[PDB]
Structures are given as structure tokens and as C-alpha cells.
Amino acid sequence: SRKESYSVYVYKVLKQVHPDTGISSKAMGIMNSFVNDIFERIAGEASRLAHYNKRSTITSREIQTAVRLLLPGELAKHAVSEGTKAVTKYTSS
Amino acid sequence: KESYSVYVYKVLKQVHPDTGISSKAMGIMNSFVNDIFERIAGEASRLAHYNKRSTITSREIQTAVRLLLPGELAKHAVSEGTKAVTKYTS
Amino acid sequence: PHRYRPGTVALREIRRYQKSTELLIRKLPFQRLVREIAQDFKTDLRFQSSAVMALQEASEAYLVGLFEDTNLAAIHAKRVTIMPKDIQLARRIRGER
Amino acid sequence: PHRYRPGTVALREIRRYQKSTELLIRKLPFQRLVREIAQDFKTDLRFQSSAVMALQEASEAYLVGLFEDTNLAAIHAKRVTIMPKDIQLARRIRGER
Amino acid sequence: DNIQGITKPAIRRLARRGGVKRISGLIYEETRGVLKVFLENVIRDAVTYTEHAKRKTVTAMDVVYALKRQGRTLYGFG
Amino acid sequence: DNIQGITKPAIRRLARRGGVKRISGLIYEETRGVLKVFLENVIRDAVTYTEHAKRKTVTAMDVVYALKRQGRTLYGFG
Amino acid sequence: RAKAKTRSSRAGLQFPVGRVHRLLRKGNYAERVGAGAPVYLAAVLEYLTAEILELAGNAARDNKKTRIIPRHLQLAIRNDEELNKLLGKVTIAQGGVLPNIQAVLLPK
Amino acid sequence: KAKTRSSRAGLQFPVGRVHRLLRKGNYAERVGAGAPVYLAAVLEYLTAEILELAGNAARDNKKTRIIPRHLQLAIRNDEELNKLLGKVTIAQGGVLPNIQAVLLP
DNA sequence: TCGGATGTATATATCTGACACGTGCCTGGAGACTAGGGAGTAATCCCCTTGGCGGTTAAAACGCGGGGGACAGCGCGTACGTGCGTTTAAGCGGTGCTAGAGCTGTCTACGACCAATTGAGCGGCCTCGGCACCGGGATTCTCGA
DNA sequence: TCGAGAATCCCGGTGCCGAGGCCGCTCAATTGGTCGTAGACAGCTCTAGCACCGCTTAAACGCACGTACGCGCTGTCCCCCGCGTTTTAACCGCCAAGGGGATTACTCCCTAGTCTCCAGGCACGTGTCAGATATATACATCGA
């Protein structure tokens, strides 16, 4: 039973933000369920967007539109900006 | 363009032989059929993903029907589905 | 001078507007409102007639549902008139705010 | 020989159970109720302690939200004590019949 | 503005369809506000849908998809 | 008769957590009824998931799925 | 070479087995689709359509009309206690609302 | 020699795992190269905001370890995160302490 | 407004049990190369959406009773807080143990997949009967008396 | 009770346009073969859910007394309904155009696919400190 989770990555994010804090096990299980829910939500919206336009590929445009649809205003703007920044840096290197 | 128009018309005539249906009512029926189809198919796919199954069979559709239809509706729907499956296999 | 008692001309029209399936809002002002609201999102937009019709139908259904809920709220407070506090009560219980 | 005036002990409690997170319902009675309800669907059906705890917490949260909604409905009616009509109004506005 | 195009008789007719006997004077402005909020919410999603398709026309599919996104599925348009 | 196992002070504690000052007598019975309805609805889907899984034990993940299908997403169990 | 008997006729249905199979395959629901799943789904859809059309025709007959209009659909959905909750979150275009006036509001 | 796609994008969340889950989820026939990067970036930003609010809410309680109660407080107190997670129940989270003004004497 | 008596954080020692850190290994994520198919680009061209003009009038805006309902004040008696003894049962700890979930090993029947091929379903054209509408009449609420 | 008045159902006559049927006529659903493989089936393991059993104690409860307030009654008064009068812009029909939403043809480049290897992350073991808990103290408040 090789169970996969987001423990290490979310811990890295916390150390990036708050270097002197920790996550309890129940709180970390809640984090994992939050990230899984958001991931499946965005992926489902992107799949719906691709199927609505007779398109058979999930690209960055679909994820951008999905995150613009689901997240609230300033959250959507910040998420879109950060995602575009990450995509450009990945493309450059 | 794909539409359940002739199919809904046939079902209507089978149930009410002397009853017509308007174009807007037919469009609403088509939208209802599409909505129920996508709902049941999504639930069946979700079941297959939960149970680590790569295919959707009559079991997944039956469980999706039981989930998405309340009470007597689910019972009669699974009855008709089982009847049709048994008729098709034989 | 025959004067109808205040109140009968309410339930009378209520029977009519529940028996009918009209849209109860003038199409051109609602289309203008939709164009104005969408102007704040993209400049120089075009709307299909089916799109504005669907928007009008959705707003109609939403508003009649909200009016039913606020009528229930006003009845609960031992009143006949609907007042805005009932509106925010219904919208808050419905999870909108 | 003193006595706390009605109203203060309600808040000494409302604050206590709002600032602290607990389950507020005895585990074994709720588990027995869950098993009794599930008996009507499948016979001799087993459960997991994690599933029982999940049902526990979901029921707690559902009732807490329902109690906030019904409290607000009662306050809307110029009242303080919550009546079953308040619960019915909250459930009808939320759409739960 | 154009929110005033939703006239007082329109609000009265909507309340009558909802089954309301007497309307207070403050209902109309609040109804206009809530209608504006709902229309903004739906139109945001519809316009994002029509941007994603690289289109400058808002079709009925965009509107029905936006309505379905907020759990307000609409039958009769495609 | 385990529906009475949810005692009156339990409903009182839940109301206090929700922020309620005074309680009527019928509140206990009404809350028992609504809780019974909610548990019946959730457990129906949980047992259906168990049936489709060919299992005889209701895991917490099935309860999470049943709650998610009902529009009440649950975090902290998977 | 034998006669091309349709799958819907083979299953004694009216809804398309082949079209539902194609939609299930192209809908990206699962990597593979079973043989009996389209038949079962077509049967369920046909039963639901039959129930909706039966109640709509009854409502139309109550209105002395022969052709079915969206108002009859709305009446059929909102009068039944199960189709209403199945379609509680949907709106029927031009269907209106079912007549309902609260007893408190009535005079005397 | 091998460099992970997460580091190549200057991110912490696994781009490879996101790509694999996009393939495995039957979401679409094909997955673009940059779609997993964008999705991982969005998830990383959302988690960063959630963890920041959880951390400073926990520090408000003089606790250096974040518990589900801190998560609930952080989500409910923020306007936009509350809107995003309005229909979400956090286990062992509790509710915001608030009493209506009419109830007070 | 205060003597004073509570459940309100505050100040400090003791376990202690979850938490974060070595660790190792195997398995999924990177590099490397093909190809071939989904998709961008280009042109086009025809639908349809925007725009605006004139006529009709149904609908909206406005003003004026005035009456019925929203709201404030009082009385009451009735149900709902509060200590309290108890008794009722609920967590808390320990073990038995066994149905049952989870992982393995065949291998078989079932699901793609591709080459005909054909009939069922879709697009366009009548075409007439359902239904909308109008106009006069019988019929049914209504509200002052 | 009741009758003039005002809606309201009803029925007959007229029009007109969508529902329905028919006729080509593509294209995608059917047949029929292989080809691989998902899970069907049987089996072994170990694990955690069920049952008991007793202990100690939280709390549920049934019962009293005081009283806060939920509700009904009285009264006021005010604002919203009903109707008549006066705009007015919504609606319908029409015409013009341009623009952009679907299409068809052509590359083309990007990702699925397959082979190889390695490093990272997850299961395991473990020393450690964040925090619950026990004990005594400042302290914002119901009655005269």
C-alpha cells in the first residue's frame, strides 16, 4: 500500500511562509483533502471547458479559465498571475 | 446535429398515442435527457475511479441510478434496466 | 362608485400571474441592463437573442423563488407585507450572504 | 443564597462551546443510532470507527448550521426563544422541505 | 444607469407571481440590487466562457453553462 | 429506540454552539426528527457505495463520498 | 452476412443503445465501456422520459389541450413528489410556477 | 543531471505528480505540457495563502503548531476563502464565536 | 455603585505522546527519440446582430383618498431557566477472535479495433389542424346596506 | 341576505403557422474476424471491528421555584393599495451593413508512446519538546 500524499510539499510551503511553525496530523489530513478537492475541481472544470469547445487537450489556457471561474475575484487574479509567472519561468528554462 | 427528438416522440406516442408535443417542449425534453445522461455517466465514472476500475459496466450505471434517483424512481429504473439487460444478453 | 376592498386586487392578479407563463419584465430594458453589466467585463461585446432570453428566464425564476421565500419569511414574522429585512433573511438562509 | 438572572448562563455557555471545538454528542449512543438507521438498508452491515466519527462530525456541523439559521429566523420574528416553526422555516428556505 | 429599467410594476408582477399580497416601498430598491448582483455573477461566468472560446459573441451555451455552474441548470436552450 | 439517545442537553449544547439563548420544548423532538432524516439520507448513499464496492464494512471514505454527493464536502478523513 | 438488427431492437428498447454507447465512449468517462452499460443507461433514460411524458400528457389533458407545452412540463415536474426533488435545481423555460397562495393571505 | 520539473519552474508542488494525476483522471485525451505547471502553481498559491492565514491565526493563540481549529478560523475569517469554501466542513474546526446583538442584555 | 462570590486568563512545574528528523530503496519522474495526429494559421463567406426610423399604444409614472395593517404599550400566566441528589449510563482500560479487507497467481472471457456496408436518422418541402384570438353571452365573486 | 357591478368562464367563428409526415441520402452503427488484457475467480494473510467485562465518574434526569417574555388585546397613525389622469418608451415592422462564427486546406510541432536510469519520497525507527494538566491568583461583574 504505497499511499501518496501532499505532506512534504505542503510542509515545504509552510516553511517558505512560516519557518517556525508546524502542522498537526489532523490539520495535515485536512490540508491533503483541501488540495485534492481543489485539484479535482479545477481539473473537472478544465475538462468541461475542453469538451465544450470540441477540444481534446488540457492546456494552460483551460486551467487559466478554470481557475478564473472557480476562485473569487482577487484570489482569481493572484492565482492567474502566479500561474502565468510559473509557466513562463518553466518555458524559459 | 444530434437530438433525441424522434426518440422522445416515439416514447410519447407509445404512452399517449393521441398527444402532440411542441418544439420548445421537445427541446426541454432533449435538455432533460442530456442532463440525466451526463449526471448518470459522471456518477458511473466516479464509481469506476473510486473502485480502481478501468471500465464502466451495468453495475456502475445501476449504482449511479440508485444514487441519483430517489425512492420509487430508482426502484423502477433499475427494474427496467435489468429487464433490458436480460433481454439484450439472451 | 364601486371601490374594491384593498387586498382583493392582490390575490386576483396573483391568480393571473401564477396561471400565466409570461416573463413579466420588458425585454428591451432588461437587455439594456445586461449589456451595461457586461460592459464592465469586456468592451464591445455582442449578445445573441437566445443568450439574453436565457438570462431573462433565469433572472425571472430566481426572483420568483426569492419572492416566495421572502413571503414565507414575512408570514413567519406575523405580517402580510414583505419588507427588506425579509429579503436579507431569505438570502442569508439560502447561503447567498 | 444568590441566583444568576436568566440569560447570563446561556451566554456563559454559548461562548464556551463556540470558542472550543468538541463533538458535543455522546459517541456510543450516536453510533448505536447510526447502526440502527443503517440496519434498514443492509442487514448485518459492519462499520468503521472512522466512518462513525465522520458521520458524528457531519451531523454536528449540520445541526450547528441549522441552529444558526433557525436562531436568525427566530430573531427576525421579534423573538428570542426558538420554536419548531423556526426550524421548519429554516429548512423550507434552505430547500430541505 | 439602466437598473431603473426594472420598473416598480415589474417588481410588483414578480411578487404577484411569487404570491405576495402587499409590497413595502423599500422592496423595489433591494430587489433591483439583488437582481444586479445575480446578473453580475452570471454574466461574469458567461463572458469568461466566451473569452475562452476566443469569441466576441455571448451565445446561449455560455449562459446555460454559467447558470449550471452556480447550480441553476436551465432547460430549453440547447 | 436510539433516536432518544440524543439527549435533550445534547440538543441544548448544539444550540448554544450555534448561539441560541432560549429553547422551546418541541425543539428536541424536531431536531431528533431532522437528524434522523439527515442520517437516513447520508447512510443510504454510504451503504450504496458499500454495496457497489462488494464490501461489508462502511469505510470513512464512503461516508466522505456520500457527504460530497449531498453538497456537504468533508475535510479531515481522506 | 446477416440482417443488420439494431441493438435497441435487440434489447427491446426505444432509446439508442449505439448512440448512448458512442456518447459514453467519447465522453471521457472511463477508459473502457462495458457492453451492457449503454443498454442499461438507455433503458433508464427511456423509463424516465416515459414517466415525464406520461405526467405531462395528463397535465395537458387537464388543460383541455392536446399538444404538450413547457407549462405542462413544469406542472408535471412540480406536482410529483419525486420528479420535483430530482429536478429541484433546474428551471423550465416558459414553465412558470405552480399555483399556490398561502392560506393566511386569503380574506376572512 | 536529471532536474525535476517542479524545480525547473521554481515551484514546490510536484509537477510530475500533477501531470500523472491529470493523465489518470480521464479528464481529457491529452494533457498539455504547461497545464500541470499552471495547476501546480495555482495549488501552491492557494496552499501558501491558507498556510499563512492558519499560521498567523495560530500565533494569535500563542501556539506554534497549527491545528484544525486554526484552519477553520483562518478560512471563515477571510472573506474570499470563506466564499470558496462555503459548503465545506472542516473536521474538529468549530465555528466563529459570534453572538447576535439582540441576545446580549 | 460597591462588599463579595463566581467562573473568567494568568503564572509555573511533569509527563507525554505526537512530531520532525536519520534512512534506505524501489519505483515513478526525468532525459532521448519518433511520428503522426490535434491544432494553429489563412482565407471566405454567409448568417445574424447591431443600428436606427416611424407608427400604436400598453405600460409606466403621478396624484389623491383612505383604510387596513405595521407597530408601540400593558397585562398575564405560562413555559423556560437554575441548583441539586441521584442514577443512569458513558468513556476508559484490557483481552478474545474471527469475519472480512487487502494483496497474489492464473487466465479467461470481454472490450478495442479495423475493413465493408448498409439502414436509420438528419436536412429540406409541403400541409393542414391545434391553438391563439376576438366578440358576444351566461356565469360567478364582490362590497356597500 | 342581497343586488348592481365587475370580472370570468364559455362557446362559436376565423386565421395562421408550427407539428407532422414524406423523400432523398450520408455516415455511423452493425457484422465479423483478430489481439490483448481487466478483472473474475480462488486463495492466503493479518487486522481491526465486534463482544464482553469491570471501573470511575461525567452527566442526564426528574423535580422544585422564580420570573422573562410570548402572546393576546387596545389603540394610533401612516403608507400603500386602488383608481383616474398624463406621459413614454416598449414593441413591431422594416431595411442596411458589416463582422465574425463556422467552415475548408495546409502544414507543424507537441504530446502519446517507448526505452533507460536515477533520486526522492514514503514507510520505518526514533529522540525530542508543545502542550495538556494540576495548583493559586487578579478580576468584570446580582442586592441593597
Residue numbers in the entry:
A (entry chain H): 32 to 124
B (entry chain D): 34 to 123
C (entry chain E), D (entry chain A): 38 to 134
E (entry chain F), F (entry chain B): 24 to 101
G (entry chain C): 11 to 118
H (entry chain G): 13 to 117
What's written in the study?
The nucleosome consists of ~147 bp of DNA wrapped around a core octameric histone protein complex, containing two copies each of histone H2A, H2B, H3, and H41. One of the most common forms of DNA damage is the baseless sugar moiety known as apurinic/apyrimidinic (AP) sites, with an estimated ~10,000 AP sites generated in each cell per day. The primary enzyme tasked with locating and processing genomic AP sites is the multifunctional nuclease AP endonuclease 1 (APE1), which is a key component of the base excision repair (BER) pathway. During BER, APE1 functions as an AP-endonuclease by cleaving the DNA phosphodiester backbone 5′ of the AP site generating a 5′-nicked BER intermediate.
The second nucleosome contains an occluded AP site near the nucleosome entry/exit site at SHL−6.5, referred to as AP-NCP−6.5. The APE1 cleavage rate for AP-NCP−6.5 was 0.12 ± 0.01 s−1, which is a 3,650-fold decrease compared to non-nucleosomal duplex DNA. To determine any structural differences between the three AP-NCPs, we obtained two additional cryo-EM reconstructions of AP-NCP-6.5 and AP-NCP0 at 3.4 Å and 4.0 Å, respectively. In all three AP-NCP structures the AP site adopts a major conformation that is intrahelical, though we cannot rule out heterogeneity in the AP site conformation. In contrast, the damaged DNA strand containing the AP sites at SHL-6.5 and SHL0 make extensive interaction with the histone octamer. The AP site and surrounding nucleosomal DNA at SHL-6.5 interacts with the αN-helix of histone H3 and is in close proximity to the C-terminal tail of histone H2A. Subsequent modeling of APE1 bound at these occluded AP site positions revealed significant clashes between APE1 and the histone octamer that are incompatible with APE1 binding and DNA sculpting. Together, this indicates large-scale structural rearrangements in the nucleosomal DNA and/or histone octamer are needed for processing occluded AP sites, which explains the moderate and low APE1 cleavage rates for AP-NCP-6.5 and AP-NCP0.
